[PDB]
Symmetry: C4
Subunit: 329 residues, 4 copies
Amino acid sequence: LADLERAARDVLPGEIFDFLAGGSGTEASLVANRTALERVFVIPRMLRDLTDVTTEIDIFGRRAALPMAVAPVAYQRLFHPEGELAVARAARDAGVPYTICTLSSVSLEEIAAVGGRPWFQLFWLRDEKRSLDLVRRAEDAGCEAIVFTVDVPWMGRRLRDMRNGFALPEWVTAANFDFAPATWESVEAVRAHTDLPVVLKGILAVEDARRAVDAGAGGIVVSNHGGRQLDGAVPGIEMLGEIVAAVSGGCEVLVDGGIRSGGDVLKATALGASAVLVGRPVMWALAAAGQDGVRQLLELLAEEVRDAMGLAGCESVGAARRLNTKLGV
Amino acid sequence: LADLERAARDVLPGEIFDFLAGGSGTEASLVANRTALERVFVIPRMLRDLTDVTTEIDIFGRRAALPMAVAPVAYQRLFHPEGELAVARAARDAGVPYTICTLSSVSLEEIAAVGGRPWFQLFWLRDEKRSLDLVRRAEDAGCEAIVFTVDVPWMGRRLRDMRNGFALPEWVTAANFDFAPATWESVEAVRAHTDLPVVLKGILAVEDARRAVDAGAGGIVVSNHGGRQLDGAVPGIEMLGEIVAAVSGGCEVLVDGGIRSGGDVLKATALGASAVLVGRPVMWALAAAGQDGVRQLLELLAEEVRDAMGLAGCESVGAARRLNTKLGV
Amino acid sequence: LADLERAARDVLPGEIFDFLAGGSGTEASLVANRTALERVFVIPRMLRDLTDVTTEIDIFGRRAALPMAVAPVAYQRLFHPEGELAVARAARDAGVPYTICTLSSVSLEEIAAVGGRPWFQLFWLRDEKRSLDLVRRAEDAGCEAIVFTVDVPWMGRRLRDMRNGFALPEWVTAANFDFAPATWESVEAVRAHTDLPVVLKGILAVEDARRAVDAGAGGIVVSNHGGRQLDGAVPGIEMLGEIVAAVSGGCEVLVDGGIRSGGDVLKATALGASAVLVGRPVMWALAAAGQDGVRQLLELLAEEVRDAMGLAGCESVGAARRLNTKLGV
Amino acid sequence: LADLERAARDVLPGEIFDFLAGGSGTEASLVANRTALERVFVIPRMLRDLTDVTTEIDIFGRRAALPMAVAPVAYQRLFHPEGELAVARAARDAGVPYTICTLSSVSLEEIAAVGGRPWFQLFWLRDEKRSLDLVRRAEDAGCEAIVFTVDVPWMGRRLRDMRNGFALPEWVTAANFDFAPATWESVEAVRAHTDLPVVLKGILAVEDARRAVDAGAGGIVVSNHGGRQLDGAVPGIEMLGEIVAAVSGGCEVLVDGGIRSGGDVLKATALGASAVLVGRPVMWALAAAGQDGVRQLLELLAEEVRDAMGLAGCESVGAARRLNTKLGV
Ligand SMILES: Cc1cc2c(cc1C)N(C[C@H](O)[C@H](O)[C@H](O)COP(=O)(O)O)C1=NC(=O)NC(=O)[C@]1(OO)N2
Ligand SMILES: Cc1cc2c(cc1C)N(C[C@H](O)[C@H](O)[C@H](O)COP(=O)(O)O)C1=NC(=O)NC(=O)[C@]1(OO)N2
Ligand SMILES: Cc1cc2c(cc1C)N(C[C@H](O)[C@H](O)[C@H](O)COP(=O)(O)O)C1=NC(=O)NC(=O)[C@]1(OO)N2
Ligand SMILES: Cc1cc2c(cc1C)N(C[C@H](O)[C@H](O)[C@H](O)COP(=O)(O)O)C1=NC(=O)NC(=O)[C@]1(OO)N2
């Protein structure tokens, strides 16, 4: 995956690339997501039957080809003319869920029409009733899950964007339109307004994970927002195992932040994740070769996950979740 | 804050800058203050009401705009012609306490007259009665607290200053005048001579913190003197949580050493500090733009603290003190 | 040993060298084998009788001159015209066992005829009966042990070899011929087909080690395959002490991965290993000076082991196994 | 102390300097002595009476000006024409014990005649009776202690000296003459032959320290021989606290390895050492300015120890031994 980031830097406007790659503050949490994953070592199992190694999972009542979904990333036409439609098509063809962003540069109904059963990421707005209508739009459009982003009461300070003066070009729009901090009351409002599973994205505290289950969430994403919100927030991968134990199967526990390979997916699943989100790498593939580049990234990731699982002695993702790990230096 | 240190290095005499930036010996403790803060990760809380995020604290019976005060730094006219008056004015306007140094290049009565209710840092002198008169002067002048510096029985060996031959220029004076090691007896002498809270600055041992409370101190500053006294002294941030537990609310527990951002203030408060002191960065802003530069530093710090608190789910500094942390590598 | 790797890089084709030196993926496990050994510190014992320091061990009923054997490395004619015969001769003369590889560039019967009682590494094939005939060939040829490689259900992804397009030259053959994942059933099939001790190579999980003893294995090699299989697999040296305790003498426990000196052998034995395997360094000596270069490597290693043991106060390898260690940074 | 090492490198023959500076093998233990000290942080005490800060200790019935002695270093005329007489004179004038080496380039009776009550380091020889006569010579000459070196059954492999071909020049002699591994029997032979305290140098195992007390030793030096014997031996400073607790005052516990400052002496004493040995820095001062250079090094070290103790709140070395420490990264 390191290959295509080189290709993405060359073709992208230098300040668009930094909007994609950057974190908040000193980017301590952005770097820590990677160091956290690199400290994790897997204890593989040997000599088990690998007749039918399968990377498939069931999540929110639907099968997925991989323990993975495309993370919500706003304004995907910043990276390629086809934007979200290109990514959604490749995700659909790969059997991987795709999270439609509230700030998508193509309307959510259009992305949903691509099929491949997508998810919708909600930013709490203005008034409750606009937010809830956005939820209803997503559900009417056949979205399968509401990914409620809970770690953005406001945008963290991106020192890359203040020093770049970066601003939305004229050709990139918030196609869903023509904000406010979310609370547990907002979560209950969404939950009461939809039959779709509500997935809280940006959970890092063990008791926030427990309360998420109590609040009726169908899932959480253990995430420090790719190091883009609180600078110095603990990496999600560092809280994952604790959160998995506290939740005790009460909801799906996803994780994101620095997933760069099938080996990283294996590490995440061995720490207990149901699935991972992948953000920045999907955008590199988009900016370097559009829908075909995304589809190839997903193919390579699919192959790496399958390879890592077999070398670890895991015929299923469930077996991968039962692997032990050891922390290194 | 890294921006202005560049600006301060350019305008300051190279040996004045090193007097400001340096530590003792190999500067192991100076570096360790920063590494200690960078190892601390905050576990943010989500979805809490942030209607009225306030960074204000009460300390020594008075409200402060931020959990922060300006640290005592001697001879501030070494950095800018207006010296302590410039810093005291900006601190007052920012709602932040200002510690008048015993070795101030402007008399303490003048700095106190600026208003904004200041603190006085005491170096134990010569004879008890000169030290106590200095205390009485500070109290007569309306100073709010005596910050008794307890970690300087004598100056640590600054290898930057011996190799520079650095000495006070002719235009910088100890305006309060026309020393000796402090003991617990000296502390009791001060305490008996003043109704002001006595704050012991330079406490690193848990039992020194307990004894400080027993001795009647109103506060302590957990501090290795910015790495300028004992080289190899533990960083204050590394002892803070232990000291907070041992004191059990018996006095205010401040910390200093390497605070460079609002995120660092959040980390300090999450470890249990009542407030932080900020030293070197305040002098950079002073040397780069005088009173206006200090005021802007305090404004930026105030904004960073507010941002960090909200992203961490803390509406008040008290909630920030209840945040959990996790140590990284 | 660092000297000759320089010599091996100069004379080897740059892509043959990388086939030898490389790991899978990001080579995180290849590097970790070395960092794991470098973190280990030995607590030497003083003032013990060193009259007859001996580095000899008994393993699989036979004496060996050193707690060491040559690791299975395929296609040794890739490194020198005499290939496996050169290494086998030097190993025999050094009193060190030599593991014949299933993919040897010289038939196993020829290598076995060199004498010095060798071992045979088995890759599970195609059909059970071809694999078992290969086992019978090895036993008929006087091989002393079947080293069943259990961590290669398939080859890990060598990013050095995909980026090199590396492929077997025309002059290098799989001389034993004219594959499939191994399971515990395959292990039982081998065990039932031979009176030779079966040694499972590639065990990293404590319960795989216990099951190996239960399955009738005569030994295991605690190994992540030199970092060439699962990228991110824990280093064998990091699991060695735990595995030794769990096995409780039930079988021989060997270790490999990054052994580069007699000091490393001492560390391995102090962690509890019966013996180590040495792979890449033996090939460097082969590519730099053929049989004479291998013999000199084994002589230097033999001297370093003897020196390290004496400085540690160990007259025998058994005493070296009772040494304590301490982990550093 | 870093200043004079620069001066020593310039004036010394490049291969003489490496004989002085080098360790065995990869020099992992040489480096680890320094990293071990740098990880140690002292928790200073405040506000204690420092009326009469004294760095003096009693050891082996005699007062010393500092918790320090000059370590045995062979062939001191390799570094300066006056050799051991220059160092012994400065040590005497500094009130610091001086260890006469068995391989001194000036006879032990001459060094002893300098006065300042010296120690004698014994290498076990040839036959018991030559070793015991060397002991008797030292005692007849007024030496105060026999420092029995127990970690050299033979010389560790100095890779700097094999690659230099370094050999004794014609002008440097083993003036005490005209070897064998030491055992606990050798220790008892010495102990029975002398009324002087026997000090075992090179103890790293806790049970070797306990046995040393049982064997009647008056002291031990916790030491990995400056990283020159077993490469990968644990640093002495890493075993010091454990060894101090196990010995429970039963003998003096000294430590050496990487002591480069008064702060390092403080760290050693806070970990429980009675005193430190200093080796390489004393030779740098000798090679850079002879007796006057050594005397100045001892003066600077004496000042640094006094400074560090006062900043740590210690009026005596005994108080310094009761300081707590904390390990860093
Ligand atoms: C450019 C960009 C935009 C967004 C995000 C991340 C990047 C880099 N993210 C974070 C991702 O969803 C993943 O959490 C993270 O990227 C995983 O890390 P990796 O890139 O290392 O795989 C968003 N999350 C939301 O919920 N809503 C959004 O609008 C979103 O933030 O405003 N837009
Ligand atoms: C130049 C200078 C002068 C002083 C101090 C620090 C510097 C850098 N300090 C230490 C500061 O008060 C903070 O403890 C430290 O600076 C926090 O670290 P940060 O700079 O990283 O924020 C002093 N403390 C006293 O009590 N009395 C003094 O006269 C004082 O020392 O002699 N003069
Ligand atoms: C080029 C090469 C080929 C093989 C192996 C290793 C290298 C480098 N290895 C791994 C070694 O046996 C050691 O485990 C490892 O090299 C120890 O690490 P060190 O080099 O640092 O000493 C093999 N193992 C098998 O069982 N069968 C094989 O065919 C084998 O793999 O396909 N061929
Ligand atoms: C050149 C040299 C020679 C000797 C020693 C050390 C050096 C560097 N040493 C080790 C020192 O006594 C200290 O243990 C070590 O130097 C402390 O470390 P520091 O240099 O960092 O302070 C010896 N020890 C003995 O017992 N007998 C000897 O003949 C001795 O070894 O053969 N000659």
